Amino acid sequence: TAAAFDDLRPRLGRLTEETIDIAREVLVEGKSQSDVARERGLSRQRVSSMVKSVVSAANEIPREWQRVEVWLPPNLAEKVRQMEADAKADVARKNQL
């Protein structure tokens, strides 16, 4: 991952900067998981899960999708909510090989 990372940041919401900074040392800077885990006082399992979060977030949402923050009646708030689930579901089974 190069400047592809810096383009993943919007979709890297819900994660913190340390979780993002840490995974960037691995995916872009080429550092090792176990090395940075010792650098920032962490289990090597967390740094595994940290990047896997950053990585999966890439596969979960294509860069074409748009981020929309909207206030709705409770009836229709579930609809858009549920349709994103069905929309992420449809992207998910395409990853297959």
Q: Which residues bind a copy of itself (CB under 8 A)?
A: 11, 56, 59, 61-62, 64-74, 76-77, 80-81, 83-84, 87
If the CB atoms of residues 7 and 18 are measured against DNA, the closer one turns out to be 18
CA distance 31 to 67: 31
Helices 44-60 and 74-92 pack at an angle, to 10 degrees, of: 100
Structure tokens at 52: 């896997």
Q: Which does 84 bind (CB under 5 to 8 A by kind): DNA, a copy of itself, none?
A: a copy of itself
Regarding 11 and contact with DNA (CB under 7 A), the answer is no
Structure tokens at 62: 């294509």
What contacts 8, CB < 8 A, 6 or more positions away?
A: 54, 57, 58
If the CB atoms of residues 18 and 84 are measured against a copy of itself, the closer one turns out to be 84
Binding site for DNA (CB under 7 A): 14-16, 18-19, 32-35, 41-46, 48-53, 66-67, 74, 78
